[PDB]
């Protein structure tokens, strides 16, 4: 349809605020939608939504549309909002006096809260009408709107205050910046772990029994960088989950799966070396081939039971307004769990493996000083990294995970996500820590030439 250059700016504004979907999806009420929040129908029939879409677009879309087609739909919604604004004696005087950029901020509010909701801002609207930008920005910052949706409102208020697109220019610079850093993190995890996996499979010297456990670690960390970290990066750079409610449950399960398998494998490796370093002869006889494959299967079976079973059975769901809101919203994929799962998952994933690894590696330090310049220094710094890097990466998260479940207000969501990325970073550190043998080095060089 007819596009303008103003029209494209208000399109990119909400593309950032609300997201763009070029395929039919469901909104918070289960209603079929496309584009930037364009309701197709309240009918539960996907074909009926496809008929409404084809009538409006003028093409057999079969549910998929282009960006230009989404802008056609978007501009119609903007025209309707504007016609509403002009019929309302509370919004027309303010609207008529605003420049085009601040005029898009007001339309943004109406898309978020509705015409009636925005008309209740009597005093802020009067201040905007009188061009009292800083005073209007202060008053709006005190709003219920600001406290409910601070990031959205910071961007909109900056638009009222300055009349520019800087809040959205800055958001987009940040988005590309983190996307770079995320892709780097994804590269290190995948490369380092795929390098360890192939080194074991193409070298008979490396196919020992201890390194069979390290293959489990490298595999739990490989899925981490192929499925968990990449999709977890989409929530950071785009502020939303973009893949529907069903994939939010699966992603959440695959993450808890791999995090459980990875840490418990560090626990098995910690036990393995303890037996070989202390009682190497009973070690070589009791730990058979099938017993080593017995532990790894047990680790993964436990990991599936604590991830796919409770999450898909909705046992992990909290029952507050904040949690139920995120569950009904496909665009929300926050980790909001109840107290029981938050503790039970933390114990099975982190706290039990921490206690074993801490106790085991402490006793290796004990029996080393009993049977004594000395090389005890080079082995102590080694233990300091195996436990230091592990603890430093996951301890902040699993402290916040248990606390936040009881006191939701103490752990900020931003801080909570950050601690979870420290744990994500362990999947890159493990191949550096556990594959430092001369056999790996001769193999790693053999693969890269």
């Amino acid at each position, epitope marked *: 349809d007819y596009k303008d250059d103003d029209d494209a700016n208000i399109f990119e504004m909400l593309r950032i605020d609300e997201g763009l979907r070029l395929k039919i999806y469901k909104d918070t009420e289960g209603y079929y939608t496309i584009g930037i929040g364009h309701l197709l129908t309240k009918s539960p029939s996907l074909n009926a939504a496809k008929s409404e879409l084809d009538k409006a677009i003028g093409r057999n879309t079969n549910g998929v549309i282009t960006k230009d087609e989404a802008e056609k739909l978007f501009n119609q919604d903007v025209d309707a909002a504007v016609r509403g604004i002009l019929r309302n004696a509370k919004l027309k005087p303010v609207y008529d006096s605003l420049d085009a950029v601040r005029r898009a901020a007001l339309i943004n509010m109406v898309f978020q809260m509705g015409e009636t909701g925005v008309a209740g801002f009597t005093n802020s609207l009067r201040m905007l009408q009188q061009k009292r930008w800083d005073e209007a920005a202060v008053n709006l910052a005190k709003s219920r709107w600001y406290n409910q949706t601070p990031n959205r409102a910071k961007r909109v208020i900056t638009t009222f205050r300055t009349g520019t697109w800087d809040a959205y220019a800055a958001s987009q610079q940040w988005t590309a910046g983190m996307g770079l850093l995320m892709a780097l993190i994804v590269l290190l995890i995948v490369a380092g772990n795929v390098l360890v996996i192939v080194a074991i499979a193409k070298t008979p010297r490396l196919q020992t029994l*201890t390194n069979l456990f390290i293959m489990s670690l490298a595999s739990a960390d490989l899925v981490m960088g192929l499925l968990v970290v990449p999709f977890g990066a989409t929530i950071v750079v785009w502020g939303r989950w973009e893949y529907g409610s069903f994939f939010c449950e699966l992603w959440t399960s695959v993450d808890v799966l791999c995090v459980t398998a990875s840490i418990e494998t560090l626990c098995v*490796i910690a036990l393995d*070396r303890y037996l*070989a*370093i*202390t*009682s*190497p*002869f*009973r070690y070589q006889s009791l730990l058979t081939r099938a017993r080593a494959r017995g532990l790894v299967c047990t680790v993964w079976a436990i990991s599936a039971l604590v991830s796919f079973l409770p999450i898909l059975m909705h046992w992990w769901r909290a029952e507050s307004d904040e949690a139920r809101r995120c569950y009904n919203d496909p665009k929300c994929c926050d980790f909001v769990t109840n107290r029981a799962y938050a503790i039970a998952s933390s114990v099975v994933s982190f706290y039990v493996p921490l206690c074993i690894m801490a106790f085991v*590696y402490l006793r*290796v330090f004990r*029996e*080393a*000083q009993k*049977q*004594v*310049a*000395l*090389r*005890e220094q*080079k*082995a102590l710094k*080694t*233990l300091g990294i*195996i436990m230091g890097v592990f603890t430093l990466c996951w301890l902040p998260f699993f402290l916040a995970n248990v606390v936040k479940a009881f006191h939701r207000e103490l752990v900020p969501d931003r801080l909570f996500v950050f601690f979870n990325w420290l744990g994500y970073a362990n999947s890159a550190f493990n191949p550096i*820590i*556990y594959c*430092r*043998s*001369p*056999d790996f080095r001769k193999a790693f060089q053999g693969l890269l030439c």
Partner: nanobody
Amino acid sequence: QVQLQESGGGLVQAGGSLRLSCAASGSIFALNIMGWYRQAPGKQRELVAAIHSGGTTNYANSVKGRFTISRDNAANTVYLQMNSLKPEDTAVYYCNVKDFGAIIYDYDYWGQGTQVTVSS
């Protein structure tokens, strides 16, 4: 850096005895395995006696009873007091040391070897 000296080798008649001595210089980690390996012409390398820093032993069952391995208190040396020699024990005996300074893997120290032939 770390070198291990290898003494006690020689030729002897069937039924005699020997006493292999292996002294390892350099610094090593407190938990280790000092062992002896033999390779006869033809067949590949095999272990005979290993001794852990705690005291636990492991003797090849074709070799146990006749052979005894020991460690020195406050000395990085291993002694293989061997008796009741048989003509099937003609092999170069190697001194091996398992270093555990790096906790995740084993770090082998090998030796040059001492020839041992036993007369029919």
